[PDB]
Symmetry: C2
Subunit: 187 residues, 2 copies
C-alpha cells in the first residue's frame, strides 16, 4: 500500500460540494482519483485547483487528443507513473484510435505523429524534467507550428501536470486497477 498514512482520503459521499470539480476529473477518467478526494479536505485548495483544471477541457487552440498526449509525455518525463497512468487511461477512453495512444511515448519516431505534435510533445518532455532542459531549438519548433494562443495552452497543460505530479507524489497515490492495466499495456 501507500507510504503515506498521515493524510487519508475522505469518502465521496462526504464531500458533495465538490461535485463540479469531481465531474471534470471523473468524466474523462471514469473514476475519482484519491488525490482529489484527499484534496477535498481543504476547500480553498480543492475549488481553486478544480477551477484551474477545467481550463484543460476549455482550451480551444490544440486538439483534444494532443492535450492528453502532452499530459502523458509531461508526466512521463517527470517520472510520475501515477499521473502517467491516469493521462494514458484518459487518452484510451477518449481516442478513437487506440494504436496512436500506445505509440505516444515514441512520438519522435512513430508514424502516428506529425511534426506539429512532435514539436509540442518534445517541448512538454523537456519542460517537465528537473531541471528543465528546454533549449532554443524547442522554442523555435514550437513557434513554427503553433500560435501564441496554442503555446499558452500547451504550457498551461505542462504546468498543471507539474501540480499533479508533485501532489500525487506527496500523497503517494497508488495506481488504481483500471489505469494499472492501461499502463501495463503501453509498456
Amino acid at each position: 500500500d501507500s507510504m503515506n498514512t498521515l493524510v487519508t482520503p475522505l469518502q465521496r459521499s462526504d464531500a458533495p460540494q465538490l461535485e463540479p470539480v469531481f465531474r471534470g476529473m471523473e468524466q474523462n477518467l471514469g473514476f475519482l482519483p484519491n488525490g482529489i478526494l484527499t484534496m477535498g479536505k481543504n476547500p480553498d485548495l480543492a475549488v481553486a485547483f478544480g477551477g484551474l483544471f477545467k481550463c484543460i477541457d476549455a482550451f480551444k487552440h490544440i486538439p483534444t487528443e494532443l492535450k492528453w498526449a502532452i499530459a502523458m509525455i509531461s508526466s512521463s518525463a517527470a517520472g510520475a507513473m501515477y499521473c502517467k497512468s491516469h493521462f494514458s487511461h484518459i487518452a484510451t477512453r477518449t481516442h478513437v484510435n487506440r494504436n496512436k495512444v500506445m505509440a505516444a511515448f515514441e512520438f519522435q519516431t512513430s508514424d502516428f505523429y506529425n511534426e506539429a505534435e512532435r514539436a509540442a510533445l518534445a517541448f512538454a518532455f523537456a519542460n517537465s524534467t528537473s531541471p528543465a532542459h528546454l533549449d532554443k531549438e524547442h522554442f523555435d519548433e514550437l513557434a513554427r507550428y503553433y500560435s501564441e494562443e496554442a503555446a499558452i495552452e500547451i504550457a498551461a497543460i505542462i504546468a498543471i501536470c507539474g501540480f499533479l505530479n508533485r501532489w500525487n507524489a506527496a500523497m503517494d497515490s497508488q495506481i488504481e486497477a483500471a489505469p494499472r492495466a492501461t499502463l501495463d499495456e503501453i509498456e
Copy 2:
C-alpha cells in the same frame, strides 16, 4: 534576452480586469512578474491560477516563514532558478530574521531550523525532483511533526511550485533585477 519569442507579455494597462490577479501576486513580491503578464493573454488561465496562488497566503496551519521556505526549497530542488529567486525575494520582504532565510538551503545542518522544519523541507526537496525520491522516512518525519491539515497545505505549496517551475521554464521568464540581487546574496 529570452529564448521565448512566440508568446510575449502584455502591458499591465491592457488587462485592467486582471487587477485582482496582479495585486495578490505583487503584494508578496513587491513587483509584477513577467510570468503573470504573459499568462494574462489567457484571462481564464490567469484568474484560475491566481485563485490557486492565493491559497498560499490563506493557509492557516503553517507559519508564513515556513511557507516561503518550502517554496524556496521546492523550486531549488527542481532547478528553477527563476522561482528560487522570486520566493527568496518574498522571504526577505516578509521574514523578521534575514539570517534564517539565507541558511534555508542548508536547513539539514544549519541551527536556525529545528527537526520539525527540516522534516518539512526535506519532504519538499524530495517531492520536487523529477522523479521524486520521496521515501518512507520523509512521510514518518512529516507525520511525527505535522497534522493532516498541515501536511495538505505543505504538499499544496510544493504542487503550486510544480506549476510555477514549469510555467516560468516554458516562458523562459528572465530573472528580474531585485530577485537577481537576492539570489546572488543567498548564493
